[PDB]
Scaffold this active site. Structure first.
Site, PDB file in Angstrom:
ATOM      1  N   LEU A 137       0.835  -1.188   0.000  1.00  0.00           N
ATOM      2  CA  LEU A 137       0.000   0.000   0.000  1.00  0.00           C
ATOM      3  C   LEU A 137       0.875   1.245   0.000  1.00  0.00           C
ATOM      4  O   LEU A 137       2.002   1.231   0.501  1.00  0.00           O
ATOM      5  CB  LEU A 137      -0.932   0.017   1.214  1.00  0.00           C
ATOM      6  N   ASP A 138       0.351   2.323  -0.574  1.00  0.00           N
ATOM      7  CA  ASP A 138       1.066   3.587  -0.596  1.00  0.00           C
ATOM      8  C   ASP A 138       0.872   4.322   0.725  1.00  0.00           C
ATOM      9  O   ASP A 138       0.177   3.861   1.633  1.00  0.00           O
ATOM     10  CB  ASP A 138       0.594   4.449  -1.764  1.00  0.00           C
ATOM     11  N   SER A 139       1.505   5.490   0.836  1.00  0.00           N
ATOM     12  CA  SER A 139       1.304   6.330   2.010  1.00  0.00           C
ATOM     13  C   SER A 139      -0.089   6.947   2.028  1.00  0.00           C
ATOM     14  O   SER A 139      -0.671   7.129   3.106  1.00  0.00           O
ATOM     15  CB  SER A 139       2.380   7.410   2.055  1.00  0.00           C
ATOM     16  N   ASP A 150      -2.743   5.481   0.930  1.00  0.00           N
ATOM     17  CA  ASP A 150      -3.591   4.405   1.426  1.00  0.00           C
ATOM     18  C   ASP A 150      -3.558   4.339   2.947  1.00  0.00           C
ATOM     19  O   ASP A 150      -4.589   4.113   3.585  1.00  0.00           O
ATOM     20  CB  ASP A 150      -3.150   3.077   0.822  1.00  0.00           C
ATOM     21  N   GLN A 151      -2.381   4.550   3.541  1.00  0.00           N
ATOM     22  CA  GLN A 151      -2.275   4.589   4.996  1.00  0.00           C
ATOM     23  C   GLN A 151      -3.048   5.765   5.577  1.00  0.00           C
ATOM     24  O   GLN A 151      -3.707   5.629   6.615  1.00  0.00           O
ATOM     25  CB  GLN A 151      -0.808   4.663   5.408  1.00  0.00           C
TER      26      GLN A 151
END
Ligand SMILES: CCCCCCCCCCCCCCCCCC(=O)OC[C@H](COP(=O)([O-])OCC[N+](C)(C)C)OC(=O)CCCCCCCCCCCCCCCCC
Ligand SMILES: CCCCCCCCCCCCCCCCCC(=O)OC[C@H](COP(=O)(O)OCCN)OC(=O)CCCCCCCCCCCCCCCCC
Ligand SMILES: *C(=O)CCCCCCCCCCCCC
Lengths: 177, 70, 55, 155, 122, 79, 87, 56, 65, 171, 459, 128
Positions: free
Chosen positions: G41-43, G45-46
């Site tokens: 997941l990307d940042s 997404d976080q």
């Protein structure tokens, strides 16, 4: 800006904070769930369009114009959580957060109503006064010469001893006293 | 179930002061109120009357309540 | 955790609901006339409040 | 405490300026005293004149209500810039625009109130008629005199 | 409210001022005009303690309504007939006032036409 | 104390306005991954709420019926 | 009003919310699965995950603590610490 | 006249009683808000009588 | 007993509160319909409004000159 | 009891009750309950207290002050005669203040009692209040916190000089 | 007046022959007995004053001040016995002796029929207070405070002595009963102008006037608690009593010579209240509030109308009680936290709830909540100044707004908010402090039931 | 474009619109590191004095004592009479006094002149 463990905010941190603020304000403008979902996907597409940019000055200018764009289109009053600062119930229970050192001034007549609790309090205080010198000796040899550089504290390296400076962040009052 | 101790400051001394204040006020307040009631009921107040001829009153005979005259 | 089944809240809201239903009628029919009520006016001035609220 | 930790007079040489910057626990480059015009400030630092509301609310301050840290140089007007008092946080609208909009609204409302006072509304009716010489005796006129008779006819 | 526009947007020579009215004698155009008749005695209104703005030319119906209100306690909905009679006579008095205003307006228009004719010859 | 959550397979965005948002984004070329999270508000007891006029007209049927009955009773009572 | 919380309920609710995410295969995530590495997941997404958990539990997680919440166990421990559960 | 003024002044005195009740209390009051609510309901009735007299 | 809280679902309802709400809404609408059937004048108009343009100049006493 | 001449009051005229409706008014039932439950025990208690008071009787008197010469017949800087005159003047000042209080109480009672027709029926009380206020203002106003009989004598002398000059210039 | 003087001087062998542990008990007990005895002065008449002898008399103005003094002495004995706990016994007896001597001079001051005897006692009151301030004060600048206080008072008061002796030589007597009947108009000249200045400047300094008030936020601050109580509660009222007694000889020159001080004191209360808005010290804030209230009393005395005089004496008594209570509360905070900074110890309502209630009551009486006698005095002065001129209502309304502002700022800063984290020596309130607060509060609240005994000689 | 945010005295510029925030040069990084070091050293001192189990009192703050001494006991030693101080003192000290004196004197002169001619209505005025 103001950080305990770092002296600055990175570029990625600034981008993420801008993304969260913009999505929260867009939720404030777009009170319905489906409408907010649609416009959140549009904003996510806009943020993902310029994700792979290696020019630092161009990424900086994109961030600056994005902040200007957000400031032009912010909500006059966004949605704040009730316990978040600026909320309606923020710092509401601070009048009920009596610190734990007030129990040492209780009369013995009202101390007899809770015998086991005050026995546990006595052994907790015995543990704290036994561990204080060990934890300050640990902290003394871990600080580099010239003072600490950040505000992070070390943990307890060996077995038996508690982390240094632990009392007032373990015995803090509950959120709903 | 799930009863938590509530940390509060020592309320013993404040309640003790309030109890002492109430007791020491009432210790003379109750007899004075009883005495005033008994003065009012049984002795009673004076009645306005014209001065008899040739008679001079004392300086305390110009007041109505018995306590004020005393 | 939606709940409103408390006797205190229901009873207080009920009493003020009965008040907000009938108290204007009872009070306005019980008070004595201390002025002369204006009751002759054109049709558009009589329907001004209702039309404005509907709009 | 000692007399070398208290504030002093305006520093002239860079040596006493550096000593004062170390005294107030701040960097020499960021330490600016008040200008020496004789107002009485001394060498007390000129902090950037921002209210405590602009501080980070999520930081763990030593004094959380005041958003203040122990040992940090305290602003000259800190009792004025508390969260109970004057705020300096940024606004969604420029200050001049809010000032002109509010003033224009108030002035326009006052002008139109004056215009409506000049040209009022009324109804196509004559004056109200009252009996007994426009209620002369009921209005407090003395009865020993006699008023001019106010006569109302039918129509 | 057409008279508002006829006085403000129109001309003020035809529309009468409400603050100074009537400006004509009551015998002008009215032969053998009679006065209004007061039914309630001055003492009768005085001892019934009516409000001074409430002692108009139809206070007898008001006194009857107040007696009906007092004698019908606790039935607060007992009599609306006396209230309706008082309100109807109020409506008649308001119609009288409207007639007076319309009479003043027509007299002012007639005077304006007379001066216009007088200017037409002289 | 311990509470049991319902199933998670049952939150499907079909038949809800989130499906309309899905097809609009599919026309553009985007997706919403959180659409199944908001799908509970559009299904179950929270579906097909009343309009404004239906909210103001709550209980109008029984009120009108009672009014008709009372008017008929007053009509018969005056004779 | 205000029903209490436990680690089991917190973990079940946080795994429910993370299971309703379309970008995570529900048969692969666990209590200690990472976001950038174990899930890909990307940042952003976080960030969206953290905002979803804030909306779920009704309280705001500050950014300076949101950047470090990288697996569901740390989210559970952060919520447990902020709401003072198992007292 | 002897009922009007008596009932008005006793409505006011009835309202002011629970302040003195809570000020001269030592132990914890047994459902004090219920006592205040009952007092206010009784005061509402007691003040409702003279308004009926004035309406009559 | 009390009402058990539900997760992500429509909450539990008592029959008593639904009955009370429906009864009071019906009471309000019955009262409005009853008072409109009886009064119908405080909203619609009490007395006719005479237009002053239709009054003859004879009853207003206008001299033709 | 008080004196009904200093504090006048017109006779009370109450109308007869006419029950036009058949509904029983609760006020009569409440008056019956008030006389049964409240008036009778209070009357009995007052009877007992008055019986206790009638067993012993003693009187208090109203103080009478004889007239002494005023400040007009006192030699200047003669502290005895001036002291007596000053005390007499201060007593009359207090009595005049309470006379104005009596007239004000009369006016307020008339305004409350006459109801809505108070502007017509309280003409005599308004005239009495105006006259007594004019007399009080001409006698005691504008003297200061250090008022004395000499100040009042000087004020009256100045007013009399003004009146004499006004009647000389109008002759 | 010898029936109150003799027990007061008999308090001296009582404190000098008591045991090492029974000095406070004996002195407090017998001073409370004499305070109870002081109620016999209320035999006042509507025409004549209560004239005891050739040297002593007491009318209805001096009687409330006397009762206030004789009641205030045991309060100072109760207040000052905690910070003198570790002191030497001889120094403790000397402190109690100075308090007794000050009370003796104060009760001989208010009853002096002769004006020069009033002057002698009024300047004999300087020595015990100066000694108390400069010896038992806690700070460095108590010596500077004593110098400022002493020299302001003496520089103001030496022309008063010269003018009083001139009045004695010209009129033949300084007896106040004689001067009521032998008074003469004072014409407009330069000689009479400087007569007015000489007779007025001593009491203008002692009150204080705005511009001559520089000694007050020093003497009120570096003093001990008993010194601050006797300075705020009684010693400021010597100036008020002096202007009430001395204005009789200064007519009709007062009506235009009072203009500059009326403008100084009308504008001065706004300045002192604004100073109170931005004070970092609690004791200094209370002192500046005292300056503002005494400016109100100055205006009331200077316009010389009956309503102004009644408001002035009621306001004097009320402000004495309120300022004494506020100084006591600030002293209790100082004993708890060992600092006078207002921002240091915050949120004490969560720790000290009944003390917070006492703070709330003192603050409420400070901003003149009706029907307290504070509001009665302030209201009467406001009415009389409105009769003087109409823009005085603008000035008084501004002063009332700022007064409410700084009183509630005091209360909200000290008692409300989040408590200070690192302060952990906040002991529960003693019975002695609560008894002191209640003995300040209960007479103040009881006097609203019978306010006629504090309304001066022209009630 | 978008309307530029103009800062005022009572509405500061936001930290996200400041052009000096996005500076990445090593001098600003060194300055921020030095400021963080000072803050962390002071926090370490405070927390060492704060968590002591044997302490029962007040952790004295020299910054607060410094602030109070600067606010109170430094103004006159650091005061020099010049044009600015004397001008402000004459404006704020004798300005309002003269203004209010002339206002009140004019009002009282007008009232006293109207009273002596009997033009001022004083019919029911017997309280003063
Ligand atoms: C706290 C600081 C401020 C203090 C201010 C104190 C008051 C200011 C004014 C005081 C003037 C001096 C006393 C005057 C007493 C007058 C009595 C009298 O009979 O007057 C009529 C007499 C008149 O003289 P006579 O009465 O002998 O003559 C008979 C009368 N005629 C004239 C008609 C024939 O006045 C005088 O003799 C002169 C009065 C003026 C004196 C001027 C010098 C002093 C100037 C002021 C000094 C102020 C203190 C300075 C120091 C401050 C500290 C460092
Ligand atoms: C500093 C701290 C803060 C302030 C504290 C208090 C300070 C002020 C105290 C004293 C104030 C001044 C004295 C009172 C003046 C009242 C008005 C007055 O009478 O002024 C005198 C004079 C007025 O003129 P006129 O009426 O013609 O005088 C003839 C009188 N036979 O006026 C004039 O002719 C103009 C002035 C001439 C010089 C006067 C000098 C003597 C007075 C001051 C000493
Ligand atoms: C002439 O117009 C007579 C009526 C009074 C003046 C105009 C009033 C306008 C507002 C009331 C009507 C509003 C209709 C929606």
């Amino acid at each position: 800006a103001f950080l305990p463990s770092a002296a600055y905010l990175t570029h990625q941190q600034k981008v993420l904070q801008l993304y969260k603020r913009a999505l929260r304000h867009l939720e404030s403008r777009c009170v319905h769930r489906d409408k907010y979902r649609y416009f959140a996907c549009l904003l996510r597409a806009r943020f993902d369009e310029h994700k792979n940019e290696k020019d630092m000055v161009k990424a900086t200018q994109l961030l600056r114009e994005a902040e200007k764009e957000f400031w032009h289109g912010q909500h006059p009053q966004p949605y704040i959580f009730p316990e978040s600062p600026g909320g309606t119930s923020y710092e509401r229970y601070e009048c009920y957060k009596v610190p734990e050192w007030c129990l040492d001034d209780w009369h013995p007549s009202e101390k007899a109503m809770y015998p086991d609790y005050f026995a546990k309090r006595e052994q907790w205080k015995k543990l704290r006064r036994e561990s204080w010198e060990r934890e300050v000796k640990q902290l003394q040899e871990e600080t580099p010469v010239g003072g600490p550089r950040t505000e992070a504290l070390p943990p307890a390296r060996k077995q038996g001893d508690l982390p240094p400076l632990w009392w007032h962040i373990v015995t803090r009052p509950r959120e709903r006293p | 179930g799930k009863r938590l101790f509530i940390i509060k400051p020592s309320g013993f001394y404040d309640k003790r002061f309030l109890k002492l204040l109430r007791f020491y006020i009432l210790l003379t307040g109750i007899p004075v109120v009883i005495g005033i009631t008994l003065i009012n009921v049984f002795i009673g107040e004076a009645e306005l009357a014209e001065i008899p001829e040739g008679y001079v009153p004392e300086h305390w005979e110009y007041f109505k309540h018995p306590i004020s005259r005393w | 955790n939606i709940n409103e089944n408390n006797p205190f809240l229901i009873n207080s809201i009920k009493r003020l609901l009965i008040g907000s239903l009938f108290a204007g009628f009872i009070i306005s029919n019980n008070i004595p006339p201390m002025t002369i009520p204006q009751m002759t006016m054109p049709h558009y001035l009589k329907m001004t409040a209702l039309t404005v609220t509907i709009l | 405490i000692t007399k070398d930790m208290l504030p002093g007079p305006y520093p002239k040489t860079p040596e006493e300026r550096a000593a004062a910057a170390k005294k107030y626990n701040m960097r020499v480059e960021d330490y600016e005293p008040y200008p020496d015009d004789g107002m009485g400030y001394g060498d007390y630092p000129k902090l950037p004149d921002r209210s405590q509301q602009e501080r980070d609310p999520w930081y763990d301050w030593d004094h959380p209500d005041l958003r203040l840290n122990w040992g940090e140089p305290m602003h000259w007007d800190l009792d004025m810039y508390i969260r109970n008092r004057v705020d300096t946080s940024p606004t969604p609208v420029n200050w001049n625009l809010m000032c002109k909009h509010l003033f224009g609204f108030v002035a326009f409302m006052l002008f139109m109130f004056w215009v409506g006072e000049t040209y009022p509304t009324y109804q196509p009716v004559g004056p109200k008629q009252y009996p007994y010489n426009n209620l002369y005796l009921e209005r407090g006129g003395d009865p020993n005199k006699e008023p001019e008779p106010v006569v109302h006819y039918e129509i | 409210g057409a008279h508002l526009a006829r006085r403000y947007l129109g001309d003020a020579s035809v529309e009468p001022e409400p603050l100074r009215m009537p400006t004509f004698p009551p015998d002008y155009g009215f032969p053998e005009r009679k006065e209004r008749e007061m039914v309630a005695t001055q003492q009768e209104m005085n001892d019934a303690q009516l409000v001074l703005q409430q002692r108009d030319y139809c206070a007898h119906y008001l006194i009857r309504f107040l007696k009906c209100k007092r004698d019908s306690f606790p039935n607060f909905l007992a009599c609306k007939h006396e209230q309706h009679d008082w309100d109807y006579c109020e409506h008649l008095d308001y119609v009288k006032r409207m007639k007076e205003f319309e009479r003043e307006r027509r007299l002012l228009q007639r005077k304006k036409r007379r001066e216009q004719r007088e200017a037409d010859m002289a | 104390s311990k509470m049991e959550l319902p199933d998670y397979k049952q939150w499907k965005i079909e038949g809800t306005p989130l499906e309309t948002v899905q097809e609009k984004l599919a026309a553009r070329g985007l997706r919403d991954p959180w659409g199944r999270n908001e799908a509970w508000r559009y299904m179950g007891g929270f579906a097909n709420n009343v309009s404004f006029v239906g909210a103001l007209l709550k209980g109008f049927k029984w009120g009108f019926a009672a009014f008709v009955v009372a008017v008929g009773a007053e009509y018969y009572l005056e004779s | 009003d205000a029903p209490p919380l436990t680690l089991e309920g917190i973990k079940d609710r946080v795994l429910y919310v993370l299971k309703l995410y379309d970008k995570i295969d529900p048969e692969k995530l666990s209590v200690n699965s990472h976001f950038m590495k174990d899930l890909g997941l990307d940042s952003l997404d976080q960030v969206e995950i953290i905002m979803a958990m804030e909306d779920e539990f009704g309280f705001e997680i500050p950014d300076i603590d949101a950047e470090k919440l990288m697996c569901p166990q740390e989210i559970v421990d952060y919520i447990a610490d902020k709401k003072d559960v198992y007292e | 006249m002897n009922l009007f003024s008596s009932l008005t002044l006793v409505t006011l005195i009835l309202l002011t009683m629970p302040i003195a009740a809570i000020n001269f209390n030592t132990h914890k009051f047994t459902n004090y808000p219920l006592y205040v609510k009952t007092t206010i309901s009784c005061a509402f009735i007691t003040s409702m009588i003279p308004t009926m007299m004035f309406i009559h | 007993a009390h009402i058990e809280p539900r997760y992500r679902q429509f909450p539990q309802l008592t029959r008593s509160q639904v009955i009370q709400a429906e009864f009071f809404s019906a009471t309000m609408w019955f009262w409005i319909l009853w008072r409109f059937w009886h009064d119908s004048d405080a909203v619609l108009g009490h007395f006719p409004y005479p237009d002053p343009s239709q009054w003859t100049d004879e009853e207003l006493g206008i001299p033709p000159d | 009891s008080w004196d009904k001449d200093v504090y006048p009051e017109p006779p009370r005229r109450t109308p007869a009750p006419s029950p036009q409706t058949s509904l029983p008014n609760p006020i009569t039932y409440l008056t019956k309950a008030f006389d049964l439950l409240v008036d009778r025990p209070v009357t009995l208690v007052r009877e007992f207290i008055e019986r206790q008071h009638a067993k012993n009787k003693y009187y208090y008197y109203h103080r009478e002050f004889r007239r002494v010469p005023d400040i007009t017949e006192c030699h200047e800087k003669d502290v005895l005669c001036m002291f007596e005159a000053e005390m007499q003047w201060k007593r009359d000042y207090k009595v005049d203040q309470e006379i104005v209080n009596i007239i004000q109480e009369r006016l307020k009672a008339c305004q409350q009692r006459e109801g809505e027709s108070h502007r017509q029926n309280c003409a005599k009380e308004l005239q009495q209040f105006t006259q007594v206020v004019k007399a009080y203002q001409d006698r005691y106003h504008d003297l200061g916190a250090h008022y004395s009989a000499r100040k009042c004598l000087a004020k009256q002398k100045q007013r009399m000089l003004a009146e004499r000059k006004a009647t000389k210039e109008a002759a | 007046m010898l029936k109150y003087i003799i027990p007061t001087m008999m308090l001296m062998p009582l404190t000098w022959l008591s045991k090492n542990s029974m000095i406070w008990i004996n002195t407090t007990l017998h001073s409370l007995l004499i305070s109870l005895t002081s109620l016999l002065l209320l035999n006042q008449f509507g025409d004549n004053s209560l004239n005891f002898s050739l040297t002593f008399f007491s009318d209805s103005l001096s009687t409330p001040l006397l009762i206030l003094t004789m009641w205030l002495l045991p309060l100072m004995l109760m207040a000052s016995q905690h910070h003198l706990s570790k002191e030497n016994l001889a120094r403790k007896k000397l402190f109690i002796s100075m308090l007794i001597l000050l009370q003796l001079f104060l009760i001989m001051t208010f009853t002096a029929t002769e004006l020069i005897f009033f002057y002698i006692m009024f300047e004999a009151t300087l020595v015990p207070t100066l000694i108390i301030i400069t010896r038992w004060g806690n700070q460095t600048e108590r010596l500077n405070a004593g110098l400022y206080f002493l020299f302001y008072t003496l520089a103001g008061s030496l022309p008063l002595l010269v003018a009083l002796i001139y009045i004695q030589n010209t009129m033949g007597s300084l007896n106040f009963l004689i001067l009521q009947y032998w008074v003469q108009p004072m014409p407009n000249s330069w000689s009479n102008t400087f007569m007015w200045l000489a007779c007025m400047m001593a009491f203008m300094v002692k009150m204080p006037l705005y511009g001559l008030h520089l000694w007050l936020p020093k003497a009120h601050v570096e003093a001990p608690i008993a010194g601050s109580m006797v300075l705020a509660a009684i010693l400021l009222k010597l100036g008020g009593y002096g202007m009430m007694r001395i204005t009789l000889l200064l007519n009709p020159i007062t009506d235009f010579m009072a203009y500059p001080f009326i403008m100084l004191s009308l504008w001065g209360m706004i300045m002192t209240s604004s100073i109170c808005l931005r004070q970092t010290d609690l004791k200094s804030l209370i002192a500046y509030s005292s300056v503002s209230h005494m400016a109100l009393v100055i205006v009331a005395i200077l316009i010389q109308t009956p309503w102004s005089y009644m408001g002035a004496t009621a306001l004097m008594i009320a402000h004495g009680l309120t300022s004494s209570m506020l100084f006591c509360l600030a002293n209790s905070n100082y004993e708890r936290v060992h600092s006078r900074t207002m921002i240091l110890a915050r949120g004490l309502q969560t720790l000290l709830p009944l003390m917070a209630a006492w703070w709330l009551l003192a603050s409420l009486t400070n901003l003149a909540l009706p029907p307290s006698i504070n509001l009665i005095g302030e209201l009467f002065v406001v009415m009389s100044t409105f009769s003087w001129s109409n823009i005085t209502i603008i000035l008084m309304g501004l002063n009332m707004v700022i007064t409410a502002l700084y009183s509630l700022y005091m209360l909200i800063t000290t008692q409300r908010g989040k408590h200070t984290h690192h302060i952990n020596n906040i002991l529960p309130s003693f019975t002695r402090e609560n008894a002191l607060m209640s003995l300040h509060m209960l007479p103040l609240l009881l006097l609203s039931l019978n306010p006629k005994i504090i309304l001066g000689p022209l009630y | 474009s978008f309307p530029k945010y103009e800062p005022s005295r009572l509405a500061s510029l936001p930290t996200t619109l400041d052009p000096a925030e996005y500076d990445i040069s090593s001098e600003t990084r060194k300055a921020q590191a030095e400021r963080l070091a000072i803050r962390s050293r002071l926090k370490r001192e405070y927390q060492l004095q704060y968590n002591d189990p044997s302490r029962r009192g007040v952790v004295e703050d020299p910054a607060l004592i410094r602030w109070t001494c600067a606010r109170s006991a430094n103004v006159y030693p650091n005061f020099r009479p010049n044009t600015k101080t004397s001008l402000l003192g004459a404006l704020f000290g004798i300005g309002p006094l003269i203004f209010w004196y002339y206002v009140f004197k004019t009002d009282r002169d007008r009232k006293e002149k109207l009273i002596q001619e009997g033009k001022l209505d004083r019919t029911f005025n017997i309280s003063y």
